[PDB]
Structures are given as C-alpha cells and as structure tokens.
Symmetry: none
Subunit: 199 residues, 2 copies
Amino acid sequence: TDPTLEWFLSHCHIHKYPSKSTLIHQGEKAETLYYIVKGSVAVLIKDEEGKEMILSYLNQGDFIGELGLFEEGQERSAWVRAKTACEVAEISYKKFRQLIQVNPDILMRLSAQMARRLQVTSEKNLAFLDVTGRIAQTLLNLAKQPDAMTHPDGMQIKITRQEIGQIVGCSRETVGRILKMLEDQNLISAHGKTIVVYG
Amino acid sequence: TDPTLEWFLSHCHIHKYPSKSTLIHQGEKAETLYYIVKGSVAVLIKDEEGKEMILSYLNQGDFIGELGLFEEGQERSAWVRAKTACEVAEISYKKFRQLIQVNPDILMRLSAQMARRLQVTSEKNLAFLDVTGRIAQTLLNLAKQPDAMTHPDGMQIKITRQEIGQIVGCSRETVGRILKMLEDQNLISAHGKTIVVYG
C-alpha cells in the first residue's frame, strides 16, 4: 500500500476521460494540477503549418500541469488530451499547497519524476547548433537526389559519417554525436553507409 | 529580502570561487546540491578526444546537480566551472532532505527550477533544425563584425527580426520563435534591434 498517495487522492476528484477527449484546453487559466491514476495522455501544440505536434506522452503515476504551481496566472501553452480511456485526479492548486504543509511527502513524489524526467532530456551551444543545422541540410538535400532510394517512411540515402564531416567541416565523431541525436529525435536512421530520412 | 531564502542559507556553507576554478568534477559522488548566490557558472563536458565542449550557463538563483538529490548513487558525469568569480552555497542532500520537512518552501524553489527546465525541453523537425542552424550562424558571424558592441557577457550586434528572416529565408514569425528558444537556452538576449551574443 501507499500511505500518502491514498491520503492525497482522498483530497482529489477522480474522473474518467474517454480516449481523444480533452482534459485541459490551451489558454485555460491554470489552477490544477492533474494526477494520472491510469491510462495515458498526450500534450499537443500546433507548429507553423498548424499541424498537431506531440510534446510528450504522460502515463499512470505522472502529474499534469505543474509549471502552473510555481507560476501564478500562468496559462497552458499547449493543451492536454487523452489517448486512452483514463482516470485522472485533480486538486485545487490552492488546496494542494495546504497538503504540502501537512505532509510534504507527495510534493517529493511529483517533485520526483520531473527530475528522472529531466535526467533524460539534457546531456545534450551556438557552435554546436550550427553543425546540427548543416548536417540536417545535407541529408535533406541528398533525399531529393536522383540516386535516392524510396523508403516506406521516406527517402533512403547512401553516405559515410566521414563524408558528412568532410562536407560540413567537422570531425567524424561530431557526426556521430549529431547522428545519434537526430536518431533519438525519430527523424533519421543510421546503420553503416545507409541512412534513411523520415517524412 | 527573501525569508525562505534567508533561513535556507544560514543552513549551509557558502563558498567563494575565482573565475575559471572548477566546482564539480567528473565522476564525483553526488551529495550536493549547490545554490548560486551571486555570479555565473558553466556546465562543461570533455568530449571525444578533448575540447571542453560547453553545455550550459547557470546564474544567480540557480541550483546545481539537483538531479542527484533524488535517487541514490549518481556520481556523476557532467562538469562545472566558474565563468566569473561567484559565491555558491551548498548543502548535503540528506540535510536538505531534513529541511524539506522543516519548511518545504525551499523544495518549492527547487521544483520550480526543474519545472522551467521542462518548459524549455518540450518546445523542441529537420526543416526547423536547419533554420535554427542558419540563424545561429548569422548571429555568430555578426558578433565578429567590426561594428559589434562590447558586452559584459559577450558581443552585442545590431539587427532586426525581419533582416534575419531575409538572410536565412524564413518568415518573420519563425525568427521570433527561434529567438525565444535561444534566449531561453541562455545563448543570446534580444531587446528590440539589439541582440547580444554570449561568449
């Protein structure tokens, strides 16, 4: 059992959100503070060219819209929507601040993840971003070449890591540093001399 | 004045650091937890070969390795040095964990900082990363121009939002969004026609 969680939730209101239903709409005045008891949700924005862009998926046990607890008035840059029928608890920010006085443990939890949530995004300057822009261009251009292969996901090209570095003007390593990053962004794919560009 | 920051301060050792003196080394043993009372530091890393490729820039009102606090173990890759001569207060994780109980307010400001770092992360395709590389390049070359200003943090140049768009080949809005990002990353600062390039 979980002494705190159970206490915490006895101060929250749990409701169900059928898939695709929206939990928080975008310029809403933040005052909660949502805790996912079960199921998953998505954080969406619209980029230039008004396409839905997924910022993150949040799963059971995670919290929703902190960033509004430490920023009065703060709105909701990007709005929360359910992906699967899920139960979510929500508590007045005002009342939550009271819980923290009583037993500052829950605060520890939420405080948590984030951290485990940051320890995953980071370990990542101007000089660096420049090369990242150049390499992305090289791959973008090669996909439009007549010698490009057609891939179910997009276009597949042929080039060595050293060739990328020679073209852009960087070490073979810097290429791997960037290729790995781009690959983690689900934008490209690297295996030997074969590289595939998505979209 | 800042009460919750005044108590939390009396409960820990504040250290002075001359510029270019390292605070945190690689492989460390995470048990702190520093708070920059005054000045600025730089999160470095030594790369493939060598080259201190930098990583960040933390200033007054910042916590350090706050990720270590949670989750036993963790020393501790990363790195830290003082850019300018700065005063840094530090406290053992375990004592802090006790203070959290005494007055949780300080756990607020630690969580607050973590929240802000999430904001920056979520706000991140190939085409976009390409433009980001070109824009940084324009700012990079201009700071080396004879008509650049001497700024305490680096070099300050003169250019409008639309001028950058014309050079790179993007909308006036695209420049706006990218300038926001780069300023949040602590690489530049924008104020009207004035743009200052750090470093």
